[PDB]
């Protein structure tokens with residue numbers, strides 16, 4: 201079965217980051233999207249799960265996610281690997297970890313557990329690694345003695361604003377859950393205005409790839425625990441730091457296939473873990489584009505740093521995913537643009553890819569969080585634009601720089617772009633009064649290949665991770681369960697760009 205989209209992406213990754221293949225990115229065959237019996241699209245873990253339910257009273261999606269987390273952890277024979285943005289998992293997310301670990305120990309297992317959060321320099325951690333570890337030990341009760349814990353919070357670069365943003369639960373290097381959902385109660389559980397988000401669950405070789413990716417983060421984390429300004433670390437039972445837990449579990453035997461799905465796992469190392477992939481011949485012609493709307497204070501890693509690309513293959517992976525689109529591309533994000541300054545306002549190569557698609561007659565849909573969303577920098581659901589015009593005006597600009605004249609740009613823009621704010625029902629706001637907040641990091645292309653992960657399309661220099669699936673059948677499920685409903689309701693909040701019918 202042909203995989204023309206994964207093939208193009210694989211070429212981009214082998215060109216950008218050849219030395220990171222097998223660790224920070226990896227293509228594998230033989231995966232299974234991990235759906236429960238009698239719910240074939242159940243591998244797609246949407247939250248809160250209230251399409252066309254403005255009141256959203258039975259938040260069945262959140263319950264299905266927490267249940268799947270607990271069950272995966274309950275099945276752990278050897279290793280549990282969790283990463284998140286700070287804080288450490290709390291609320292129902294912590295209940296899932298505790299319940300699943302107690303069940304695993306009850307079944308006779310002595311699991312090793314890594315829990316990694318990234319922390320912004322401005323963010324004050326209320327519950328520090330030693331306190332979180334003590335809290336888990338108490339909740340684990342008698343089972344604590346059989347559980348080997350590594351708990352760590354980390355910041356890889358204070359000046360370039362880089363820390364772990366990946367959101368992973370890997371069990372035994374066999375199952376993996378990833379997506380945009382942060383494991384903290386205040387965004388998804390304890391709230392009447394819940395953020396809209398999506399995770400995906402799979403099993404097979406691509407779960408090991410995510411494990412290998414976490415081994416790269418923990419190799420750095422264990423070494424840099426010598427610098428407490430960068431790493432706070434706590435272990436239990438006198439355990440050592442476990443930098444290579446996933447590799448030790450994997451062994452020498454290659455991962456066993458569990459289905460027939462081809463998957464590209466891909467992440468990035470942000471800034472401050474590794475300066476470049478020094479086996480890489482990557483030599484891009486980096487775009488000359490200005491922006492009389494903003495200029496960065498910090499050196500622009502997104503738009504003007506060859507080295508950063510080579511240790512952040514996920515940036516080019518998303519670009520080449522969009523560039524592989526021969527018929528249509530759906531983008532569903534919190535944001536396309538970042539707050540500038542301190543970060544660049546947008547990723548020039550991404551917007552140039554999109555404009556090229558528009559000019560070639562490819563359909564482009566962009567759904568972002570409502571600009572009405574004001575929140576602090578770390579808020580799930582915030583918006584970094586004041587109006588959707590900051591997206592179409594940017595495409596309009598990149599279109600004239602491409603084509604030559606402005607009405608050629610208008611025919612591309614007005615006839616091929618759908619641009620809207622997220623809605624999940626007929627209500628413009630939650631019943632709560634507050635607006636809908638969108639936290640997806642999702643791209644889907646030609647109803648055949650899609651990314652679900654933690655890497656936003658707007659500029660950010662964090663450590664991120666996600667999966668690119670190519671599967672017409674799975675993308676059909678994605679279309680039915682998420683994209684078609686999203687457009688059904690978001691189109692009520694559509695934008696008509698400046699200069700269009």
Ligand SMILES: CCCC(=O)OC[C@H](COP(=O)(O)O)OC(=O)CCC
Pocket residue numbers: 285320323361365534577578579580581639656660661662
């Ligand atoms: C505590 C604030 C920092 C933070 O929380 O780090 C992740 C944040 C939220 O990510 P997201 O949930 O919007 O995807 O992203 C960024 O702004 C990083 C660039 C400065």
